Amino acid sequence: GSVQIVYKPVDLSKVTSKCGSLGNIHHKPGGGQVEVKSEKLDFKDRVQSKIGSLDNITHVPGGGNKKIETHKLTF
């Protein structure tokens, strides 16, 4: 007799991530007037402060993709 192998896996797959803000409509978003008045404050600690009328932040640590293929043929 005789032996024949025809090995043809076909991969058409799509691994897709769509993260954050995609295709949105922001028509006239309005941040109102902001006022901050501070006096006599005492800090023994770290300070991180942020002040603002309109913060349109998009933050993406995620959306990463991992694809692994192992192909083994042994005769």
Amino acid at 30: G
Decide: helix, strand or coil at residue 29. Answer: coil
- Of residues 2-31, which lie at the interface with a copy of itself (CB under 8 A)? 2-31
- Of residues 39-68, which lie at the interface with a copy of itself (CB under 8 A)? 39-68
Give me the least distance between CB of 12 and a copy of itself, in Å please.
5
Task: Kindly calculate the radius of gyration of the chain based on its CA atoms and give it in whole angstroms.
Answer: 28
Question: Which residue, chain included where needed, has tokens 């006022």?
Answer: 35
